[PDB]
Symmetry: D2
């Protein structure tokens, strides 16, 4: 019972193979009471989140919608109880149009597309924190998903730029969260005619990781998120935890 | 004559108190032939660029207009000569609305404002490179201006996020520029000249104190010389990198 | 029961205010079976380890002593059982002569002193890992103690050089540990109390978004225990910062 | 010239092909007056330094010898002139016994060997700075040679640990040098094909070691946006000279990467 009696909001569940689905699954197994967030296909999300070990209320949240954000805190409290507060927040939201990641050349991505990607992947981490910090308990934890953007790589393109922005956003969210006695951290996960480029990237990851890396298994990264949601990392804030097999510490 | 016979495009001159003004001044002193770019007040910018040691053609460039960027290659070539190409490109444009930096709380900056800031301060480094790489010579150099965003600090707020984005953009611009035999680097400068006033005072005082060789905020010439060192042939194996012209303050805790 | 049924070797307990004592205390509370290591004042150390919630065998280990190394693991297996193996290793060993840190100028530290410091503070992480990896279970964890050496600072001097070496040693220990299915990580702690030393120690509290209490070693001990658990299984050759987030903030 | 009228101390010239030789060659071409340092094979180094474009005095310096360090400054001043001071120092000294790098397992390197390596590769950067800072002019520059140790890699082993120690030493040397108005920086070079490096590619260390280093060198050129030529030391020599010049005056305690941009690229 690592997360026993903790109220945790989990965003980004779209499929049963989503890291957010495994974070929610592992958190419930560890005794956490969950609140879930869905963006567009809510009835589809409801049917995915029915396969979770325990029942949890599903709330609508389009992170680009100002009204959804301004009402989020009220809707969460109605779902957990008038006098109850959140102990954790999981930001597992990421988006970049295909012009900004994949086959499309880096220079050919229009700003409107990259901006939408930065809005959803980086700015929204601050939006969700602004909306939920007033309904969070001291000793609380905000966890976001990152993909190590310290070095450029093919096909990830503008999504790497959005993750660099996200890391910087996290350092500032930590400053704001600190006032509430809440921690804010990121988990940098390993990977979970541009098909050849991503194959090269995935093969290289397992090769570099001293303990190896299984791309078809999201549970080691879900456990890391849960470790950050627990009271077992209480002096860690504005930081990045690498759940990538230790591949970022190895050149070859 | 560090930059002797080099054709260099310099963006971001609006006043003579700018780093872009000193980069242009130092580059001309080192024998570089310049092409200059201005945003809106071209009449006032032409008056400012007259304070530069030598004459240089002025071209209008609003980095948010895809019409100006598409034209750039054609406009720069007619200013330097039909058969001549650029040897250097200086990106010295940076903007963030006051909602994104200063006194305004970090959470109170609307996305439209932060997006405009990221567009001008980060995305435009890729826009300018896309437009100018086809008219650049091998051994060429693209330089951008940065402010170390690795750690959060007061007031800088969303400009720190835009600079983090710029660093990432630079690593990708290096990949594209490499195909032309062109280098792409950023120069991370130290600070250049009631609560907000006290915070910035603390940041500037701390910089000089941390810097092993000290830091003079009223002097932009050590950072302009660093940009010129990157525009030269003296750093030929450096790309996708950040050169710190901050007195060594980023390597020191206290 | 975060560490339930885990056999963990803990080094560096010399006092009741040491991080190593609190790691051992927290680990026992979480259901871990411990093996302890002592360097010199082993009679005094035994009287300190009696203040631990549960009984644990104390073994002699001078990290500069070649015979103590290589005899270590055989002595561990006799203490835990012939068929039992270790699940965790805590390296909480650090030393630098006063010529290498404090008031003495950086240039005035002789190599013999800095070398002794690097031997005990950095090289010994590889020595302890070499000796204990053959008696470690897959899913195992090796944890070392670090103090962020990425930037120079007053007084820390050659100890900063030894921690930079330690960080590099840990990336290589991870490569070796990986073939046993064992993780190797460092915990970079904020200042822990035991003018120039005072000024630095107060900066951390102001920079840390959640603040920093130098008189409390329990948040750093819990971080070590989180690394010893199965809750960070994809983390290796890494550094976890338990400094209140101070390293992510300029001011 | 870039270095016109500058007095520069250059250490580590042992072969007519090494980085220290090209630094010295490029510096002399740029108008620098040099002072050279030699380890043991003095008469051999003297005829290797005769290949340099201009004549330069050669001084004996065993970096592990306390007496050689204590007399250093006096010997340099006698070679340049009683009233003249040094404008630059180039530390191009690096050593690690084969127990600490190559085929030998990481855990099998004895401390005495790794310590000798750290003494020569890292500690000596501070030793040379201590000895030469009192005879250095303000605006001066100290440059050391590095190989990016931020990530572990095959064969480099304890030399990576010595290199990590060197970067930390450099940040503290910058603090000391700052008092004299002198900068201290490291140049992190990409892989350079030295006499030993060619031999390991040929298979002097075996098939496995030969394959590992080939993988490391091939990967470097592939990662480098502008490519990487291991047989050419001149781009790294020019970077050292850029740091010795007045064109990077606000850079200290830092690392300049002359590795083709490889360290900024994952793939
Ligand atoms: N898959 C990997 O290899 C990997 C590696 C590291 C990090 N990550 C990160 O993990 C997170 C989860 O992504 P994933 O890869 O598991 O895939 P995913 O498809 O499961 O998650 C992305 C989610 O973003 C949500 N989203 C998109 N636009 C939104 C909007 N406007 N409002 C609210 N939510 C919106 C979608 O509903 C979706 O659930 C992302 O931040 C991603 O960048 C993934
Ligand atoms: N001031 C400091 O303390 C400091 C420190 C480190 C780095 N820098 C950097 O130095 C660089 C030079 O700027 P500065 O310090 O002179 O400040 P600045 O306020 O003068 O920069 C604004 C510049 O951007 C241009 N610009 C704005 N919007 C534009 C648009 N849409 N299209 C095209 N051009 C546009 C303006 O014409 C102007 O030249 C900046 O990138 C800044 O971030 C400054
Ligand atoms: N104290 C702090 O503020 C702080 C901050 C960050 C990191 N750390 C690190 O944490 C570790 C332990 O810290 P602590 O608070 O317990 O202090 P400590 O004084 O108890 O740690 C030093 C230990 O080294 C041991 N030791 C010395 N020489 C030895 C040898 N030859 N063989 C074996 N052991 C030997 C001693 O027995 C002693 O317990 C150290 O490595 C230290 O650098 C401490
Ligand atoms: C056997 C094997 C480990 C081999 O490894 C390599 O060649 C690596 C992959 C790489 O190519 C770097 C590239 C380089 C060369 C020079 C400087 N910095 C980086 N080589 C070095 O680091 C080499 N160093 C020195 O010659 C040296 N000389 C002067 C000052 C410090 C010094 O460390 C040695 C230590 O290395 C080897 O022989």
């Amino acid at each position: 019972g690592l997360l026993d009696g903790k109220r945790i909001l989990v965003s980004g569940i779209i499929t049963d193979s989503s890291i957010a689905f495994h974070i929610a699954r592992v958190a419930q197994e560890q005794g956490a009471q969950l609140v879930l967030t869905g963006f567009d296909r809510l009835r589809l999300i409801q049917r995915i989140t029915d396969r979770l070990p325990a029942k949890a209320p599903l709330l609508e949240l389009d992170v680009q919608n100002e009204e959804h954000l301004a009402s989020l805190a009220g809707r969460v409290t109605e779902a957990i109880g008038a006098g109850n507060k959140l102990d954790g927040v999981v930001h597992a939201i990421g988006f970049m149009p295909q012009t900004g990641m994949g086959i499309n050349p880096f220079f050919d991505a229009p700003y409107a597309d990259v901006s939408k990607g930065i809005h959803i992947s980086a700015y929204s981490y601050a939006s969700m924190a602004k909306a939920l910090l007033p309904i969070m308990n001291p000793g609380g934890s905000i966890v976001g998903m990152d993909f190590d953007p310290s070095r450029a790589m093919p096909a990830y393109n503008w999504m790497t730029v959005a993750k660099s922005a996200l890391e910087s956003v996290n350092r500032f969210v930590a400053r704001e969260a600190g006032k509430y006695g809440v921690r804010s951290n990121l988990v940098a996960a390993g990977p979970i005619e541009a098909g050849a480029q991503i194959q090269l990237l995935e093969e290289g990851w397992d090769q570099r990781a001293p303990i190896g890396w299984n791309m078809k298994d999201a549970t080691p990264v879900a456990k890391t998120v849960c470790a950050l949601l627990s009271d077992w990392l209480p002096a860690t804030t504005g930081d990045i935890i690498y759940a990538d097999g230790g591949a970022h510490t190895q050149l070859l």
